[PDB]
Amino acid sequence: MNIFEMLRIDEGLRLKIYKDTEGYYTIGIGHLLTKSPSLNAAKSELDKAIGRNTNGVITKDEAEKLFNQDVDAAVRGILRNAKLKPVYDSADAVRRAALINMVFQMGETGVAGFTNSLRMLQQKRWDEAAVNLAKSRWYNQTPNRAKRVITTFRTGTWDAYK
């Protein structure tokens, strides 16, 4: 199992513009287009990301291509973050994956927010972290996804996703 297959599971794959759990215009494998309410704003951003006149519809390959960039960007965004980086370097491979997932979902910023959870992960206090991670709007809005991610942090294995 790796980050890609993990995020593909959590994010899905949709070839036509859609609105995410949050109501955001999305496409492909969890690619957020805009938080704007405008559909047009959406298709514009899409056209811009793809480099062609889409009419809100993309190919498989195109989704996978936005997918690689966005995983790249999430990683980059961890290794660039004074707060994240230390946690990520402290962790084992599986748990690095779980961190990336969160960062792909919620943004670097979003995650850098979890001060206490982070310190917890850094310390390798798995059970505690998991209960702190759980007291969050993230958990209460996307509980099954969240549970997947927290289990992964707890266990350091891919069970949740098998």
Regarding 137 and contact with Cl ion (CB under 5 A), the answer is no
Q: Are 88 and 80 spatial neighbours (Cβ–Cβ below 8 Å)?
A: no
> Binding mask 64-93 vs Cl ion (x if CB under 5 A, - otherwise)?
------------------------------
Strands (E) located in 1-151: 14-19, 25-28, 31-34
How many chain residues are in contact with Cl ion, going by CB under 5 A?
A: 4
Regarding 26 and contact with Cl ion (CB under 5 A), the answer is no
Burial class (CB in 10 A: 0-12, 13-18, 19+), 16: exposed
Is 16 strand, coil or helix? Answer: strand
Regarding 145 and contact with Cl ion (CB under 5 A), the answer is yes
Structure tokens at 19: 């609105």
Regarding 142 and contact with Cl ion (CB under 5 A), the answer is yes
Window contacting Cl ion (CB under 5 A); options: 42-50, 53-61, 80-88, 91-99 = 42-50
Q: Is 61 a catalytic residue?
A: no
